[PDB]
Design a protein around this ligand. Sequence first.
Ligand SMILES: COC(=O)[C@H](Cc1cnc[nH]1)NC(=O)CN(CC(=O)O)Cc1ccccc1
Ligand SMILES: [Zn+2]
Length: 956
Amino acid sequence: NNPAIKRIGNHITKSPEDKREYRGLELANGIKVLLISDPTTDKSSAALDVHIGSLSDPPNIAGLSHFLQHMLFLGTKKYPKENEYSQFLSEHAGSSNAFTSGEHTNYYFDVSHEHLEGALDRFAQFFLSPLFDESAKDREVNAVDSEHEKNVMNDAWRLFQLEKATGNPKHPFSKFGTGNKYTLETRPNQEGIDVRQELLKFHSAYYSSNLMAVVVLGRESLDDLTNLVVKLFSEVENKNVPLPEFPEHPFQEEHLKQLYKIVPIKDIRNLYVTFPIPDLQKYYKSNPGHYLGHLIGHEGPGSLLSELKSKGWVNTLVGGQKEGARGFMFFIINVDLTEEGLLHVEDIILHMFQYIQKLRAEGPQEWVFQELKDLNAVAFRFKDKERPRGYTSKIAGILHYYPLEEVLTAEYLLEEFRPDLIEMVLDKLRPENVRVAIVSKSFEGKTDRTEEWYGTQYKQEAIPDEVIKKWQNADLNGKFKLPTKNEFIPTNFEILPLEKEATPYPALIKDTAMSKLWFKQDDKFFLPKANLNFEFFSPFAYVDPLHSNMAYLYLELLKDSLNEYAYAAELAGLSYDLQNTIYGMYLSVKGYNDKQPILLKKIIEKMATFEIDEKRFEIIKEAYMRSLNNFRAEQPHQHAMYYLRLLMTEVAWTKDELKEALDDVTLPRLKAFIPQLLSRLHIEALLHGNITKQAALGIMQMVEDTLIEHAHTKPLLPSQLVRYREVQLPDRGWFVYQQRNEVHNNSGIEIYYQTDMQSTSENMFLELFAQIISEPAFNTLRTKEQLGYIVFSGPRRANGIQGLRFIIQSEKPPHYLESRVEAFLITMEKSIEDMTEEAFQKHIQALAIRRLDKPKKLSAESAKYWGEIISQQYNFDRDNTEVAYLKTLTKEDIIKFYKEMLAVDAPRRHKVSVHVLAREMDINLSQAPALPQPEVIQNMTEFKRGLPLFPLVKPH
Ligand SMILES: COC(=O)[C@H](Cc1cnc[nH]1)NC(=O)CN(CC(=O)O)Cc1ccccc1
Ligand SMILES: [Zn+2]
């Protein structure tokens, strides 16, 4: 019946809890397509994934497909304005990104539901006729350089590329995917290449319809969506490109039995063990590598990690199958290393092979496969509903691997037990196949190679045959047992009926000296899940650096002692989060409600009766020292944010201070601290989910009762519930605090224009201003001026106060960034003056849609309430309130606000700047205004002392 469609799939299998509707099809040009109808959705989305990526770069131009991905955003023949796509999205409440992997290029956006067509049309042009404007190419090449620059001194990226540098250098695997200025401009100009041409060639050769999948999600019917996709995508030309394949492993014979000694940037100690394996993807119905991953990576009694941890050699372990590309995969087992572990690497690996050996001895286990199958079936049935943008991006990728009918279920449902495939993979995890990498500062000086892209210093050696043979003769070790039935697997999924006295917002249902309980029965999602959130206040959690360290160490020690038992819960969809804050502790327990009271109870019980294993203490204390030390290797913009938090909060201990105070933390001293911390508390909880009022009261009271029984806890006083204040900056001031980042050779800057206390009207002035300036700040500071890859603007909220911040990481110096942002703000008053009233309403509408976007899953609704609670504002209906107010605002209100609080000669401008300098320091463009001389902050304490502090916000 239809020339444009090759076929319509059968029914797409979905969870029976999934109210969205679906239709798969294949266009005549070969594009696999999933259509998703959600008449309830606030944002629509679409994604396109092309089955080409950096593994197909021309050898002489590294990073070409990554570059190309950047360039598609910057104009096409039908919408030639460089930032048409960005601006359209921004003005209709959308967003967009894209990524390039070895074999895919994935592009996605969301938009308000009623402007899908408009968004999708501009989007489709990416794949029909991009301009690759010459002048855009010159500029954007710097954005890609900067993206690489950021990655350079980071240990994950270095290791990632050293792996590729040490296999077969002829294999596409060894290519450098990001690219940079050298690879994408300098060297190609040197070599007479015209990059605009190369982009047109690569696009034309590889952006073929037969290599594409598209997902679209909207309020429209499945028929409307179909006509829509046929319309915008039928014209993508089919060039019938063979899908690249890499049947040959990049780790051939000579790349095996090798040892690599690598010097890291941070002070980390890791061991990476790797075996090449064939491509297991086509076995997705049985999934042998997940099976083995599950076992080798287990964390329960009997497990590999258990014994490594008991010998005091390792704290954490990752194991299982690692994606490679069509043709090859890897199997990994990686662990972090204690200082002892570092000297016992040979032994650690023997234990690995001993554990592998045990699996060979017992053979494949159908009951284990059965448990993965069941958990996966339950995870699927009751999956949370995804945010539309991520969902479309993800399915676009998997439309390339699975029959249309299976795309939703393919990654969840297991169908086939395959002892043959299990055994087959197992037979590859042998010493004669092994690669070993040790990452440690102890190799500084001792190395003889340099990886070319990142500068990684490392050494390579043959592992000696004595050593391989010792690994080959690994007997069984009786400390190693398979896991036993997982008792935490839930079976009760009843959705408790909705109560007569149930409310749209959480109700305060307990207001005692000890504890304040906010409660809501879920009236929206109906999954047998619940979230249980507790803020525990104690003045002794942050009274000083020493106490801070202790709170932290206590809670790390506790998590380490619970790990074995908690791991089962975690596989059963039941997990927890436990951390120290500046107010005392935070505990969250999330997942299936069916066995949640159990886990909860075990936590509070351990918490209140904890006995510290001294050896664990010593190891964790030491990881913590490195961890604080490792802050110096975080990125310049992270430093900038960090210093501003220290400058503007009433109380905050520096990393230095915590470090100094840490050699003072002794076992005696910690043992004494725990009961001190637990002795007086206040608890403010949010219990939200598939649970009743009375179940909720009981859970609350149980937590209280356990603390009382075991630690004798008594209530705090309403007065000692000190929430902290923000520094109040003088009318017309400007302060600069300056530091050096020692590792990275970029600078960072954060600029904060403080405004006033949060409240309905101050909130919406700032927020609308941010909306208006959001996309132009990106467009001006990154796209036109190319100051860096990281360019952010938006509201800052802390401690009840607020303002407007800019954050940029750059190669240029901060005084320079300063003036371009100031230049930008003028451009902004002017474009607000010049904009139509109707362009003004579009911005109101876009923010409105953003603020009113309904949470799609339980824990997003939770998060929203929790913010209301932890900020002590309790404004649960804030969104209809603020939106009502925002609609009454005019151009004039916003010009006044800007002129009062933000303009360079604003009467109430309150400006603070953190400048973080690079490793080594000390036109076409708009006019930057002359600036006042800043007060340079010398000392963070002198500075806070010398200034007022704001009130706190009044509760609702
Ligand atoms: C199937 O389970 C695993 O293989 C392990 C779990 C583990 C826990 N402690 C150690 N290992 N997880 C992984 O290996 C992580 N990724 C793969 C990898 O890079 O190794 C698998 C994964 C990630 C997200 C969600 C589900 C599986
Ligand atoms: Zn990029």
